[PDB]
Amino acid sequence: MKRTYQPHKKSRKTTHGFRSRMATKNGRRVLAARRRKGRASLTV
Amino acid sequence: FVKTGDTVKVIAGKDRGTTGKVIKALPKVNKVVVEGVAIMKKHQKPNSENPSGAILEIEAPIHVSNVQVLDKNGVAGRVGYKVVDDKKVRFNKKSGEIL
Amino acid sequence: KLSETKSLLKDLRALSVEELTTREAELKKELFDLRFQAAAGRLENTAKLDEVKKTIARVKTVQAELN
RNA sequence: AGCAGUAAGUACGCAUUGAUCCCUAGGUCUCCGAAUGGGGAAACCCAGCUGUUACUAGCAGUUAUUCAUGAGUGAAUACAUAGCUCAUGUAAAGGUAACGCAGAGAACUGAAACAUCUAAGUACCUGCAGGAAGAGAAAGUAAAAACGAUUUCGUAAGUAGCGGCGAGCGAACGCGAAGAAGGGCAAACCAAGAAGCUUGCUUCUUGGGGUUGUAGGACUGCAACGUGGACUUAAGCAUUAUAGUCGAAUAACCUGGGAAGGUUAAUCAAAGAGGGUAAUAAUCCCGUAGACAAAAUAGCGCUUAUACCUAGCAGUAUCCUGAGUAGGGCUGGACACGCGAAAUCCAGUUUGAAUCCGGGAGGACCAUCUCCCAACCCUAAAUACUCCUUAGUGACCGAUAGUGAACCAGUACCGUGAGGGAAAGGUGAAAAGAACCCCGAGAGGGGAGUGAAAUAGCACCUGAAACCGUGUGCCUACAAGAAGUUCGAGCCCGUUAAUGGGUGAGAGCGUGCCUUUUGUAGAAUGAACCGGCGAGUUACGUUAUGAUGCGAGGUUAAGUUGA
RNA sequence: UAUGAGUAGCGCAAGAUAAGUGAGAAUCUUAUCCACCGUAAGACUAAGGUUUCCAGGGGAAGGCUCGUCCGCCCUGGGUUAGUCGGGACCUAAGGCGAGGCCGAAAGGCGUAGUCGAUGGACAACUGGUUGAUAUUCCAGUACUAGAUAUGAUCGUGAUGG
What's the CA–C1' distance between A6 and D345, in Å? Predict the structure, then answer.
C-alpha cells in the first residue's frame, strides 16, 4: 500500500538542514563526526 | 642531461655506436628522439595532413643511458659541468672539453 | 622575449590608479569586444585574454593596492 | 631549455635576453560557515548609516552578542539606584589528532547462580588546558642517628594488607638509576595619605618589612655576593631549517630484439647505499660519500652592561605566622582499607577552638621521645601521546594482502536520517595501437604489414579450475553397479625403455566421505562445484623436562654507554 | 561455473492491410478503416520528479523480444511578469528566544521580540505567437504604486484611541 516517504521540500529539510543539524550542540557533533570521516557531502 | 645538442653516441641497445644530431630532447621524456636512431615507422591512415599515410619515419626515443654526448672531437664520457666559466661550462671526461 | 618587455615596461612607476591606470583600470578595463569577440569567434588569436587580464590584474594588485 | 598541470588536445602563442619551474614574502582574497546589520532550510533575501559617484543605481566600508572599561542618562522617588544610550578593548565566542586534568558516570562480566565485591570509577558524556598536563617544596616518612620537595623506572613483591576473607583486589617503607631549583605574599610592623576625619580616627590606598622550626621576622645590632635564582630585556656573535650547488672512477668481444648477462682487459676510492636503463652496472644516468649555498625565512645557542630582588649575624619589648580553621557529632567517599580497633585525608551538615609556654603527625587512644609548622600562592627538568614536518628502518605485505580505500574511496550503492559500505593494478622496451586490401548494415573478422614475438591487438604479462566443446584408438543399444578392484578374451598404440601403455567385453568379490553415537551405509547431519582466504599464538608469570655455563657460589635488574 | 532449462514467465486491453523507411521491419512512419475509454483511459493543476521537453544524429548497453523508434545515447536549443505564486506586508498552530527562571554541566523553560501559510491583506485581460514560451513575447485597452518635472496652502493627521 502506502509507503513511508512521499516527502516534500519542507519534509526533506527541517530535520536535516544545516541549522537544524547544527542547532542542538549535538547533531553538529555527529556532523563533525561526518566531517572527521569526511564522506561525499555533509548536510544531507 | 643539459640540452642536447650535438651528435650523440648510442653505446648499448639496438643500434650500437650510432651518432646523430639532437636539439629536441625534452628531458622530461627522459629518453631522446634522435634522427637516424631507433627508426620507428608508422602505418598511418590516409587522413588529414597525410592523405596516404602508411609510412611515418618518425623515430623512437631511447634512454639517457643510451644517449652519449661527445665533445666536438667525437669523444664521450661523463659530463663534468659548470666548472670553468661565468654560468656553466660543459665537458666530458678524457675529452676535448668543448661543450 | 616579447612578454618580458611588454610586461615589465608598463607601470612599475608610482603614478596612480585613476591617474596612471587610466589605460588599464579604465581604458582596456573595457575588456569588451575582445572578450565579446570571445565566443563571437572571428578572433583567431588567443593570448590577449589572460595576457590583458594579467596586465590589468597586476595593475590592480600592485598599482591599485600600493596606496 | 624549453613552457603551454592531469593526458591525450587543441590553438594562439610563449621562452637561455632568461622563460616554464622551485623557494620566500606581499597582494587580492566570490558566498556560506564561530558566521555576527536583520531575517532565513548552506551555497539566500531584505536593509540602515558614512563618504563615494550617480542613480528611482552602483562602489567602498560601519551596524550580531556577552564581558570589561569609561562617558552620559536618570523611573517609582529628592539625590541615588535600577534601567537606558554611546564609546573603547577579537577579549571571545568557534574548528580541534592524541595525551592530561576535573566533574558526571554505568552495565555486561566474573564470582560456576547471585544480593557483598569485581568488572572500574572503566564504556560513555560534559567542561577545562598546554606541549605536555597535572606535579611539588615536609603542619613528610621512619624508628634508629633517619633522612630531607617533587616526578619516572627497577626493586621491595602480590611483600604488608583488605576482602560473602569467596572470587579477587591490592601496598607503602627503605634502596638502586635518571632527573636533579625553589621562590614569592598576606600577617606582624614602619612610613605616607584619606578617613569613623565622631577629635587621639583604627578602616581603606601606596611603598618598605619578611615568609619562618628547632622557632623566624618585626625592635636593638648589620652584609651587596647576576639571579630562569638577586632582572629567563635589548645589542652583537655563531649556526640550523628555509631554494639547492658541485661532486670521481671503462673499453672491446659472444649472445640475443636489446648487454649491465657470459668473455677479455683497465680504472677509481669520503662515492661497490639505492633506483632506473628493452637483460642482473661501481666505472651509463640519477645519485651516492664528501665539499660548498640563501638575501627572507623561522629559529636555537654564546658574550655584553642593562631588563631587579634576595643574604649572614647576636639579642628578644611585645605582636605575627594563614578561624568557622583544626576539631567534635552524623551522613558519605577516597586512601590496600568492604565501619572496622580503625588510622590519615577530602566532601555535605552541625557545633566549635587554641594560637609560640603554641599547634600537629607518629594507623583507637593516654604519657615520654622523633619529626614538622598546615589551614595563602606560584615552580622548569626528567613523563604521556601523535593528526602533523621530514630523515628514514624493516627476517612488514604484496592487489581477498597491505588503510574501508595501491584504482578520482569513504567512491558507487543502500537507508529519510543517524549510519553503513563495495568491486577493480599490470599490453608492448617503445603505441611503434594493426596503413592498406577484402568480407561484413555496422561491429567483428580475414589477409597484408607492425613489433623479438599478434595465442601480443587495447578490461593486453602468465594462464589452471569447474563449464562448454571439436576431433580422435577401443567398447557399449538382453543391460537392473558407491560405478570398483582382480583376472582377463579381444582390439589399438608404442614409453622418465620400461616384466610397455591405452582400452576394455566377460567373470569373481566388493554399503561414499564427515561430526555424533552404544551402534549409522543411511530414510541422522552436512557438503552444488572449482580456486583463493580461513583458525592453538605470543605479552608477562609459574611448574616440569632436558641443553649449556659455572658451582655453595650463581646472578646483575632497572639504568648508562654505544650503530 | 553448473543445475533445473530451452521449461516457467514474457508484468490485466485488439488492431488491421497497403505504401514508405531502411540493410534489415510486425513491433519505425504515414494513409485508410476498425476498436477502446470517455465523472475518463480527457484538461489543468498541487506536492513530487529534477531537464526527463524539443530539434538533429546514432543504436555500446537499456527497452522484458525485435527494432531504423524512444523518457536510451551524442550534440544543440528550449522556461521571459509592475499585475501570475512567494518574498521586500501581517499572523495563527508552532519554533527560537536577549532579558529572567531554575538546574552537575550540556541544558530545559520563558517576558519583550523574532520568524514561521495551509490563512488575511492587492493592479491585466483579450487576440496572435513557435520546435518549444506565454496572463510573461507583441496589437488593443488598462489599472496599481512611485518618481522628477507643477497653481497647495497651514495639512498631515500616530505604535495611542
Answer: 65
Q: Which nucleotide is nearest to A23 (CA to C1')?
A: E96
C-alpha separations of B96 from B3, B18, B71, B77, C11 in Å: 18, 20, 6, 11, 49
- Give strand pairing partners of B9: B68
> Which nucleotide is nearest to B46 if distance is taken from CA to C1'?
D435
Contact B41, B35 (CB under 8 A): no
Neighbour-count burial for A7-43, b at 16+ CB within 10 Å, e otherwise: eeeeeeeeeeeeeebeeeeebbeeeeebeeeeeeeee
Which residue's C-alpha cell is 594588485? C61
Distance C4 CA to D433 C1' (A): 43
Half-sphere exposure of B18 (CA within 13 A, CB side): 16
Distances (CA, A) of B72 to B15, B21, B40: 21, 12, 28
If you search the block for the grid coordinates 542547532, which residue do you land on? A23
Residue C60 and residue C67: Cα distance in Å, rounded? 11
Break sites following residues in chain C (C–N > 2.5 A): none
Structure solved using which method? cryo-EM
Please give the resolution of this entry in Å, rounded to 1 decimal: 5.6
